[PDB]
């Protein structure tokens, strides 16, 4: 009986466990997670107004209910148990811990109150325990978001959606409250390159264009030479550039021009600007604006880069959301790590120079890609592992698995959360939502969570 374990319970951990159980009839798989509950970014990242994306949880639940799979919540690898200890107890270990940081802006004024990263803002409305006291100040009337990817569109969208539409979703009661009292009425999404280089996709661009109660603000002159610099383009991108182009140079209708007429809120895209400094309010207590540098594009195809002209533009606002990407961090200094790419160095999932040690997901390929991309790349890691198994390259001797790790957890006084234990937490979340008609009301205090379980 082979013993294997995974580090992290988001999509890379679970899709890696499903492949192993299906193609090896006796292997046992244990999954370790630092949060008390499973699923990663499917629960704490995907927006609450996107319930259909979260349906992969059903396939995860089936994997976890199998008799050769076990879950161990509330365990922080590299702190409560080290990577070397798991390497000694199992025949193989799979690092799937994602990317827990945000890329920093690194400019004068970033520390001023009213400045936040998108990732801290998303964790706030999604119920991630460490951000439950974020208390963003929504009493200003303008918000500026830096960077143009799908993450930037999701915070602009929760900021501008009429609060009643968010009513029946799983958003936090506390975040819902605060959005009801917000004065934010204008949102700007600022990029350093031009339209041709945006990072978001079409389903997401189109929901923004149609968001009830709002209107779009695109400038006609940023869009010159578009419809020509896109002759040779492939279906995907060209379609996207024509939705942006339509929306920015074509006359609405009698109805659509009137929807735009009575809308209390507005959102716009800005091009050729780069974050230079956050401006302080007269007495310094908060943020009052952002000073952007003017830029010009030099280079060809993908590979184009933005260069500065020497000019500047000051933009007033009371809320700055930094959305220029996430980033992985080293977990345990015994583990290799490349600080330039933000990944664990590897060759098709094999950690460089570390027999028995593998990787899956964002920590294996970088912090980009959707759930389906994470899924199939995880299937690849699992194939390489099972072939290394069958050919005899893993420890050819009996290994204890959880019998040994559980003895250490006990001694250090760490209480692991099992899947049946999650089934209970899950049920309490469901009944707590029953009165307000939400699918659930998320539990946010770890201490209370442990209490509801009997400790
Ligand atoms: C805001 C946002 C919205 C997104 N929306 C979509 C969408 O709508 N559609 C889509 O298809 N994709 C979306 N994605 C992308 C999707 O989230 C990723 O493709 C996917 O979750 C990456 O999976 P992962 O397993 O690598 O990592 P993650 O999901 O991050 O999971 C890593 C897991 O490891 C745990 N962990 C971390 N450190 C440790 C440690 N030391 N010990 C133990 N456990 C640890 C984390 O707590 C977590 O549970 C979104 C991403 C973000 C950020
Ligand atoms: N529905 C979905 O499928 C979905 C939904 C949400 C999230 N996700 C995914 O999850 C992943 C993470 O996304 P993400 O939005 O945070 O990142 P992303 O997609 O890579 O976009 C990052 C942005 O920040 C910019 N940038 C980088 N450094 C900058 C700097 N120092 N100053 C200014 N701008 C800077 C980039 O501009 P530049 O282009 O010039 O460099 C780019 O606009 C993506 O793969 C996203 O697609 C998917």
Number of strands: 18
Q: Mind telling me which CATH architecture of the largest domain this is?
A: 3-Layer(bba) Sandwich
Q: Write the CATH fold name of the largest domain.
A: FAD/NAD(P)-binding domain
* Rg, Å, rounded: 24 Å
What count of helical segments does DSSP give? 15
Shape: globular
* Ligands (ions, cofactors included): flavin-adenine dinucleotide, NADP nicotinamide-adenine-dinucleotide phosphate
Biggest sheet layout: 6 strands, parallel
Q: Could you give the distance between the termini?
A: 33 Å
CATH first level of the largest domain: Alpha Beta
Strand order of the largest sheet: 6-14-7-8-10-9
* Class from secondary-structure proportions: alpha/beta
Overall domain count: 2
**Hey, roughly how much beta strand do the residues contain?**
15-25%
Helix content bin: 25-40%
CATH superfamily of the largest domain: FAD/NAD(P)-binding domain
Summarize the structure.
With 455 residues, the protein is of the alpha/beta class. 33% of the residues lie in helices and 19% in strands.
What keywords describe this structure?
alpha/beta; five-stranded parallel beta sheet; oxidoreductase; 455 residues; Rossmann fold; binds NADP nicotinamide-adenine-dinucleotide phosphate; six-stranded parallel beta sheet; monomer; FAD/NAD(P)-binding domain; electron transferase
